[PDB]
Design a protein around this ligand. Structure first.
Ligand SMILES: *Cc1c(COP(=O)(O)O)cnc(C)c1O
Ligand SMILES: *Cc1c(COP(=O)(O)O)cnc(C)c1O
Lengths: 400, 400
């Protein structure tokens, strides 16, 4: 095994000097030198067919761009790179499935099962499509272990069920429900599964073949990559059966005032000029990441979180929403405003957040108006834990 | 008053040396150092609430981002910056208008007038929404001078006309239709106008107030800016009247399993994480651009295209499709393959392209299968023209 060195991984991130103690990676990730350099070069180099003094550099950029799809595929164990579609983020990917696959197939009375633990990105689009088609959203609630009650699916599925929307990993609790099982039920009922992987793709990238996943979406900026770039994975047949997304250049084959014909997947779904800087930066992020063993990287993150949780658990008033010893740590203290504490922690050099994390329904279930969340990454250290624990003590001293 | 200095202008582009004679700006523009640096800084710094050493840099990045809409507003003379919506390009902007404003309003048999000089981005979306609503697309042909025939508009407009789709400036002929008169015509008939400004914003930025434009769209990358970022301007009454675009975080106010409420515009139309680098980039590009007299800058560019056209017009077989002394020079040589010429030119260090330029109906009208295109920007020189003309000569000698 190529043993994961936390220190060498951490030293690749230029923001860390000034970032203080960065524990807000679940919201957005810091960038490695590879991503910053590739972007730098892309914007410093002509995209044209001429290079008088930097041909070598340019040929390397083109190389990253052309191999970009392949690198996402490899990450997800997708059978071939044509099942990869560029979007602007996780949000767009899901909206694409709801509009391009679902909308043209939903009839009045049809049912869309959405889990109560979903990010809005994987709920709102279904509420929309349902009011457009007359279908409706059926709720999949949490079980006793704070996870989408997948075992309840058999009861929630009727002859009218068409779609299941489930997150691989919650952005609040960090919990991962029984996805493989969920898909088995869904498929035996002729349903398609939309899987939100914005969180899962960073920590336990889904093996989309073994899991038999229909649709999978994630954002690049959480995967140590550029903003404004996302991914939609879909089985061949599904992308083929999808209708065009946005109309415009690139996505069409022939056009006239009588009508148009389109390319096939994935170009069929990619209109206009691609976010080249996004693809290249993401390709570079992935190429870099591939040097590291993610399970070892994730185990280091989770271990830090477990140390923090245990330490915080000794302070009185502590409540945790953390599932499965996750790298994410949502929590709060009784009688203290999440707003005040985030503020003080920032003053102490600690960076995290609170609020609702775009998961109003999930929070409503847990019985809270919001939570503080500290997420850990492989570039966090042991001393980061101590600093956070001490920052929290300092804050509780003033607030309680 | 100030005199435009080209030497000064072009000194800001780190790609100039390598790029040789860059004549493909109409496809995508080179970036000034300010865009590069702004991006660089953005990706090298944490977006979190803590800054221990680089606080000045972080503040200034927050300033570019907070002032972005206002700089786009200042570009178009928009009344308010709440009228500016972020997209991933001109193509997304137009798809938004078609899907969020037109689609919910169109009745069967309703008419959408589309110029034959339209880029595919401003044609396909209308073909789609027409098929989706039962409306029909009505062609607005070219006049004798290769411009959308505005005088013929009153003859094409009927009691069932609802939408006028018209490019401010063609990406082929560089021609601009009489926009102010077309709009007056359309409004007298109770029609709304979608103006594709992907070229226009670059060369003659539209005064959205003076021209009374309803919708206006353009792309960041062609405006010396980042990829994956575009703008949609719309009168505030129209944006408010639009259905939301994508569903997700940011765009929602309240969400539950019974339904949701949205933000007001522009945030209503911006779901999920925005392309923050793109915004900061485009912002920096616009701030850099505001130190130059773009009117003069455009004349300098046009002057070069005129020098180039005059010289090439002396070579037998030369045919031009240039309108109104545009800085865009589309042309071809009788009995010579464009592709071969493009190739030979590249070895002479001239960067341009051939093809259909996402404008099949226009080319079909002009009677050609494709055209070469040399577009001049303010960072080109008289030397560039000389190199172009000579490279053509050798090309002709090798291909004939
Ligand atoms: C961040 C996140 C999203 C949204 O991603 P965008 O890039 O904003 O579209 C959706 N779902 C989950 C679980 C997320 O964490
Ligand atoms: C480039 C261009 C577009 C499309 O721009 P994207 O950024 O690719 O969406 C649309 N219309 C015209 C005239 C253009 O030149």
């Amino acid at each position: 095994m190529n043993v994961f060195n936390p220190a060498q991984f951490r030293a690749q991130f230029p923001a860390l000097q000034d970032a203080g103690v960065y524990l807000d990676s679940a919201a957005t990730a810091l960038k490695p030198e590879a991503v910053v350099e590739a972007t730098q070069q892309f914007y410093s180099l002509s995209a044209g067919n001429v290079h008088r003094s930097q041909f070598a550099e340019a040929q390397r950029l083109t190389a990253r761009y052309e191999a970009a799809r392949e690198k996402v595929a490899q990450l997800l164990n997708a059978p071939d790179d044509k099942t990869i579609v560029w979007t602007r983020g996780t949000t767009e990917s899901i909206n694409m499935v709801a509009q391009c696959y679902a909308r043209p197939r939903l009839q009045p009375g049809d049912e869309i099962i959405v889990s109560v633990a979903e990010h809005h990105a994987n709920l709102v689009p279904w509420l929309m499509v349902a009011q457009q088609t007359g279908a409706k959203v059926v709720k999949l609630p949490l079980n006793a272990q704070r996870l989408p009650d997948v075992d309840l699916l058999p009861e929630l599925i009727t002859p009218r069920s068409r779609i299941l929307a489930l997150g691989q990993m919650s952005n609040v609790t960090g919990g991962c429900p029984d996805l493989a099982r969920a898909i088995t039920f869904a498929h035996s009922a002729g349903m398609v599964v939309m899987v939100d992987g914005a969180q899962g793709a960073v920590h336990f990238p889904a093996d989309v073949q073994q899991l038999d996943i229909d649709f999978y979406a994630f954002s690049g900026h959480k995967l140590y990559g550029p903003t404004g770039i996302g991914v939609l994975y879909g089985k061949s047949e599904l992308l083929e059966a999808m209708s065009p997304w946005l109309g415009g250049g690139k996505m069409v084959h022939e056009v006239s005032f009588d009508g148009f014909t389109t390319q096939s997947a994935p170009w069929k779904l990619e209109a206009g000029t691609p976010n080249v800087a996004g693809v290249i930066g993401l390709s570079a992020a992935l190429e870099w990441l591939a040097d590291y063993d993610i399970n070892q990287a994730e185990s280091w993150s989770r271990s830090l979180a477990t140390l923090a949780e245990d330490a915080l658990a000794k302070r009185p008033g502590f409540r945790s929403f953390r599932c499965q010893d996750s790298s994410l740590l949502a929590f709060d203290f009784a009688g203290v405003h999440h707003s005040d504490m985030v503020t003080l922690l920032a003053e102490y050099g600690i960076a995290l957040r609170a609020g609702q994390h775009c998961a109003q329904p999930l929070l409503a279930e847990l019985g809270v108006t919001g939570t503080l969340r500290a997420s850990f990454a492989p570039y966090n250290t042991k001393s980061d834990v101590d600093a956070l624990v001490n920052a929290v003590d300092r804050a509780l001293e003033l607030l309680v």
